[PDB]
Write a protein that holds these residues in place. Structure first.
Motif, short mmCIF file in Angstrom:
data_model
loop_
_atom_site.label_atom_id
_atom_site.label_comp_id
_atom_site.label_asym_id
_atom_site.label_seq_id
_atom_site.Cartn_x
_atom_site.Cartn_y
_atom_site.Cartn_z
N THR A 1 -25.84 0.05 -6.17
CA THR A 1 -25.02 -0.29 -5.01
C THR A 1 -23.91 0.74 -4.80
O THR A 1 -23.65 1.17 -3.67
CB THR A 1 -24.43 -1.69 -5.17
OG1 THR A 1 -25.49 -2.64 -5.28
CG2 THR A 1 -23.56 -2.04 -3.98
N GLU B 1 -25.99 -11.31 -10.30
CA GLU B 1 -26.18 -10.39 -11.42
C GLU B 1 -25.28 -10.74 -12.60
O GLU B 1 -25.71 -10.69 -13.75
CB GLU B 1 -25.93 -8.96 -10.95
CG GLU B 1 -26.32 -7.89 -11.97
CD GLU B 1 -25.18 -7.48 -12.87
OE1 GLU B 1 -24.07 -8.04 -12.74
OE2 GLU B 1 -25.38 -6.58 -13.71
N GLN C 1 -19.15 -4.80 -16.58
CA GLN C 1 -20.41 -4.84 -17.32
C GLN C 1 -20.40 -3.84 -18.47
O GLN C 1 -20.81 -4.17 -19.59
CB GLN C 1 -21.57 -4.57 -16.37
CG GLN C 1 -22.95 -4.66 -17.00
CD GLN C 1 -23.26 -6.04 -17.54
OE1 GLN C 1 -23.55 -6.97 -16.78
NE2 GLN C 1 -23.21 -6.19 -18.86
N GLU D 1 -28.39 -2.81 -10.95
CA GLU D 1 -28.10 -3.09 -9.55
C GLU D 1 -26.71 -2.62 -9.16
O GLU D 1 -26.51 -2.05 -8.08
CB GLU D 1 -28.25 -4.59 -9.28
CG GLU D 1 -29.68 -5.10 -9.39
CD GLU D 1 -30.57 -4.61 -8.27
OE1 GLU D 1 -30.06 -4.43 -7.15
OE2 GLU D 1 -31.77 -4.40 -8.52
N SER D 2 -25.73 -2.85 -10.02
CA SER D 2 -24.35 -2.51 -9.69
C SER D 2 -24.18 -1.00 -9.50
O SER D 2 -23.48 -0.56 -8.58
CB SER D 2 -23.41 -3.02 -10.78
OG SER D 2 -23.70 -2.42 -12.03
N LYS E 1 -29.56 -11.20 -4.51
CA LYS E 1 -29.85 -10.51 -5.76
C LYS E 1 -28.58 -9.92 -6.36
O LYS E 1 -28.38 -9.98 -7.58
CB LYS E 1 -30.89 -9.41 -5.52
CG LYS E 1 -31.12 -8.52 -6.73
CD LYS E 1 -32.47 -7.81 -6.67
CE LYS E 1 -33.00 -7.52 -8.06
NZ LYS E 1 -34.32 -6.82 -8.02
N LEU E 2 -27.72 -9.34 -5.53
CA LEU E 2 -26.50 -8.72 -6.05
C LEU E 2 -25.54 -9.77 -6.61
O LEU E 2 -24.93 -9.55 -7.66
CB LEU E 2 -25.82 -7.89 -4.96
CG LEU E 2 -24.44 -7.32 -5.31
CD1 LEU E 2 -24.53 -6.35 -6.48
CD2 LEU E 2 -23.83 -6.65 -4.09
N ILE F 1 -32.59 -10.21 -14.17
CA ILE F 1 -31.82 -9.18 -13.49
C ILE F 1 -31.04 -8.30 -14.45
O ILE F 1 -30.80 -7.13 -14.13
CB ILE F 1 -30.85 -9.81 -12.45
CG1 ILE F 1 -31.64 -10.54 -11.37
CG2 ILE F 1 -29.97 -8.73 -11.84
CD1 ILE F 1 -30.78 -11.28 -10.37
#
Lengths: 50, 56, 185, 185, 185
Positions: free
Chosen positions: C123, D45, C161, C119-120, D41-42, D72
């Protein structure tokens, strides 16, 4: 049957506790003779030698 | 007796990863400011120093 | 993160109405998709914790070694040798020749689908494409200061992350192993 | 915090009239809901004190291990191994293979319903969505300086609550346990 | 502090005429009441000296423990365990299970009526709601600098009162008790 008496009169708690004291000062003085049959088995040392 | 409080304070508004800093084994590399956590400080040592001299 | 979500986010940022399918014939969708693809390709070039692997290649009958189609960059791992891509084949830069003699070891960086990306990363890609389109289509207004801020916040999480997953440590160096071996007898 | 409350807050911030049901056919409600879902959702995470658990997975007959649908992010806990998600299945990044041999341990971050979220998290999500919509639909005016301030104040409380719940201490490290064991005889 | 007083204060701050009953059908009253309720719920989440108590809960026949309806947040007090609210029931985060075996101890934060709140808390809530409505309905003018100032002044008194009531001291730590026991013979 002296083996029976020998096993009866032991104190496992003291024997297990006294391992750390040897491990901090001089491990080789307290090595178990029943785990060796004439060959080297490694003995570990500590991070300090005071 | 007051001098026996052992606390560590996480500064607010700083980028840090508290979980990694507090749960990783020694020797690891982590991402964050190297000054985001500081030890509790109340300034009560000077008062002890002062009181001792008067009593003496 | 579905591509439709990114397309709708870009459209909303640009001021136009949302859509329902990425196959819609609106002309802005093609530009959005091309920009997203280009930004995705550029971002992953350096390499991260999820798209880096080591592999070995073998020569053909003539002696030419091809390279994977999905790769983005190549690097050598044999001493101080240097390799590069040229004419759809590997080039030996250290000897100025195209024909090899045996297998080689090289690092490869792969390109993945948009869906598989975290997700990161998605984005960051979406917010880079949005700015790249908005600035070129409407000028440098005062609203880009929010897109840049969102991109920076997402990049911070991405880096955190990646650092977390790699698990770097000082115990993996060989001097520590030698010290531990010495501390045994 | 019901979704209707967040929708009404966003509508009030945008200047439009309040509503009564989230099923109302007003076109702004769909955009509000999508933005809220994306922001939720973001945000989750990284992982917090209420959506993180450890679990073990088992392989199929072929040797492929699936992953939970609600997760996630995935991480490894076996030595220095690295795992990642690809093609709806776990990927072994350390060996460049898709087929495993036995069970594995991994960290999982789950996505929960909006209702179950604490008040502080819901406020942050609502105030992020409100700004994301207002800036993209009306420009960067002087009223966003209140939304950002509210978001920051809510984030401070969120972080304080998370730090309080985790209960980190220096007595949980193993050297303290060894010292206490030594102080006994 | 009656709700009618807060409603009239908000109306006066907004420029409209005062009212006589909170049941009046004016449309702004509903928005004022909803904003007041939301702000009151958010403010008391952390916990203060008048809405915090310890309680013990018991399991049902199946093994599910419900939680009080008026509570806003839950916390554990058993070692290093972690508890959270999910699906109208307590969740054991440390063991990833919903069924318990015996009673538990937890901290609870309750929500009270507006009338029972102290004057200082009511002023803070009223002045937060007033700004939240004024900014969203009329823009960020120069008059909000007085509302923020009033809120800050009220918050200072709130904090002073809370610090006064709790009566923290250094004589309540156990080392002092041990010292006093030693100073006796």
């Amino acid at each position: 049957t002296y083996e029976s008496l020998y096993t009866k009169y032991r104190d496992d708690s003291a024997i297990l506790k006294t391992e750390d004291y040897a491990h901090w000062t001089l491990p080789t003085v307290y090595a178990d003779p029943d785990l060796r049959e004439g060959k080297r088995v490694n003995v570990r040392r500590d991070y300090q030698s005071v | 007796i007051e001098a026996c409080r052992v606390l560590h304070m996480a500064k607010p508004g700083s980028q840090i990863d508290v979980d990694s800093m507090a749960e990783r084994e020694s020797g690891a590399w982590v991402a964050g400011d190297p000054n985001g956590v500081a030890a509790y400080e109340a300034g009560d040592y000077n008062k002890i120093i002062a009181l001792t001299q008067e009593i003496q | 993160m579905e591509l439709l979500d990114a397309v709708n986010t870009c459209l909303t940022a640009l001021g136009e109405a949302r859509v329902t399918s990425t196959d819609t014939r609106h002309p802005s969708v093609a530009l959005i998709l091309q920009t997203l693809a280009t930004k995705q390709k550029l971002l992953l070039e350096r390499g991260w914790w999820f798209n880096t692997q080591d592999e070995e290649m073998f020569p053909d009958l003539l002696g030419r070694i091809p390279y994977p189609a999905a790769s983005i960059s190549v690097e050598s791992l044999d001493g101080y040798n240097i390799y590069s891509k040229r004419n759809n084949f590997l080039f030996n830069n250290t000897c100025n020749t195209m024909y090899f003699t045996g297998p080689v070891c090289i690092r490869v960086t792969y390109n993945l689908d948009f869906e598989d990306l975290p997700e990161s990363v998605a984005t960051v890609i979406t917010y880079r494409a949005a700015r790249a389109v908005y600035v070129g289509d409407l000028g440098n207004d005062a609203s880009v200061q929010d897109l840049v801020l969102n991109e920076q916040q997402a990049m911070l999480l991405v880096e955190e992350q990646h650092m977390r997953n790699k698990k770097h440590s000082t115990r993996r160096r060989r001097p520590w192993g030698k010290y531990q071996n010495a501390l045994s007898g």
